[PDB]
Every structure is written in C-alpha cells, then in structure tokens.
C-alpha cells in the first residue's frame, strides 16, 4: 500500500503560569514512533515504537536539538501572532503545525505538505507544488512572504521531497512487521430492542490496521446516510483500530438492511445482513 510520515506539533501559551506547553509527535501511517513533551522530566525526543529504539545516539541528540528549535520557534510565533491579531497578553492561544510526506505503493514520493493553524483555524498551508502557500488572511500573507524567500523554500523542499521520503523508507524497512502490515477488520453485527416496535442494528469492525475504513448502511440498496450513527474510528490501544455504524430499524424489517465494509485489508468489500 501507500505510506506516510507525519509530524504534529502543538503549542499552547499559558500567561502567568510559566512557559508555553509544547508537544510533538511523529507517526508513520497510523503508528506513533516518537514524542517530545515540554512538561516531561527528560527534555529529550523519546522512542514510542520498538523499531525506532535501534537508532543511535546521533539520532536522539539531533532530533532533540531539532525538536527544541521547533519549540523555540513556536514560543516566538505565539508572541508574533498575538501582535498580528492585536490580542491581549492575558488569554491562552494555540498554534498547531503538521508536516510530512506521502509515498505511493512503489515507495516513491507522492506528495509533501506543511500546514499551520492558530486557534484551531487554518493559517497557512503549502500547495502540492512545494513552492506556493495558501494564506488565510492578511497576517498569513506576511508569513507567506517570509517563507517563500528562495533559501527557506529550498530547505523545506529538500526536506519533503528528499529527506522525509528517505527516512520514511528506512523506517518502513526497520519496522517491517509493524508497519508493512494490513489487518483486516473482524466484523459482526448486534441487535438491541429499544422498544417492542424498534431495534438498534449495529455494524462493528474490530482489530483493523490501517485506520482508514468506510462502514455504511443500506436499506434495499439505498444509502442510509442521515439515519446512521457513525462513531469516530478509535484506537483499541494495541496498534489496531475500531469503528461501528448503527441504524434504528422498525422491528420486522431487519432483512432490508445491509452493512458495507471497505478496508484495504479486505480483498473484496463485505456485505453483512440478518440472513
């Protein structure tokens, strides 16, 4: 299948209560491999996947130096953005940053990305050409001009299209058993009477990896989209994911309804039913 490496960074200012909170996590596909937390004891980038543990001290020292430069960059940004939007010193504000790269199933570069948000709203984001920024407002156009200066634009380019890709592949190789795997959902349905004329039908998918899954209910072939309760895909905690979709069915009509599961693990999409 296709693969991705993503880093996610959150900084939250906390006026009067010391330095801003900074959390960074990296992921290959839906598996976390590293963390940094400004509030933890170590003040180091820390392993979170068994396969990354084999990296030497040059890796750990360098990622720690690098993650701390991201921390410091965000600490300045928080003041900068408060000045750009004329906000007071007293409130808490959030900056979020995500970047990374996708590769196709031949492991060659597909796309690279770098997106930034301020208070949960889009701020600036890099287009697919890795050169042009989409800027939210006037404040972000100032950011755009800084970041599109040719020296700066090139360091980012060389990261996303080169380094990010090379290290993703290295990680894919080193963590083969975890990362180059597909776990097909284990599926079942349940039925519960909410009254003597109505029943909840619930379609379950358990133990699947990667997280991407589509679970939909049909009534005689028509999509029951506005009448389905569909929960957010959620982690089991052991490296696999879970999801369910539920419909409330007038009792006697169970056979009309089919659940449909699509997942890269299934060779053919499944159709489940009360026959």
């Amino acid at each position: 299948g296709s693969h991705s490496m993503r880093y996610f960074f959150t900084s939250v200012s906390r006026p009067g209560r010391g330095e801003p909170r900074f959390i960074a996590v990296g992921y290959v596909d839906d598996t976390q491999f590293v963390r940094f937390d400004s509030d933890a004891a170590s003040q180091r980038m820390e392993p979170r996947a068994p396969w990354i543990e084999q990296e030497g001290p040059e890796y750990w020292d360098g990622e720690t130096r690098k993650v701390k430069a991201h921390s410091q960059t965000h600490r300045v940004d928080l003041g900068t953005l408060r000045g750009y939007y004329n906000q007071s010193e007293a409130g808490s504000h959030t900056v979020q940053r995500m970047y990374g790269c996708d590769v196709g199933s031949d492991w060659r570069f597909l796309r690279g990305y770098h997106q930034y948000a301020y208070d949960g709203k889009d701020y600036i984001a890099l287009k697919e050409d890795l050169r042009s920024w989409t800027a939210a407002d006037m404040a972000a156009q100032t950011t755009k001009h800084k970041w599109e200066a040719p020296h700066v634009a090139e360091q980012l380019r060389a990261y996303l299209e080169g380094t990010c890709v090379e290290w993703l592949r290295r990680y894919l190789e080193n963590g083969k058993e975890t990362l180059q795997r597909t776990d097909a959902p284990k599926t079942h349905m349940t039925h519960h009477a909410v009254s003597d004329h109505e029943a909840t039908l619930r379609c379950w998918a358990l133990s699947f990896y990667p997280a991407e899954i589509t679970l939909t209910w049909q009534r005689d072939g028509e999509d029951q989209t506005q009448d389905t309760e569909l929960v957010e895909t959620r982690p089991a905690g052991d490296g696999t994911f879970q999801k369910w979709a539920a419909v409330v069915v007038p009792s006697g009509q169970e056979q009309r309804y089919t659940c449909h599961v699509q997942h890269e693990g299934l060779p053919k999409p499944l159709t489940l039913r009360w026959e």
């Binding site: 880093y7 930034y116 980012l156 990261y159």
Partner: peptide, 9 residues
C-alpha cells in the same frame, strides 16, 4: 526524521 529548519511566522 524531523525538519531541520523551522522558521518564524
């Protein structure tokens, strides 16, 4: 591997 050159907004 992290990006080596984050720049201020």
């Amino acid at each position: 591997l992290l990006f080596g050159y984050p720049v201020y907004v």
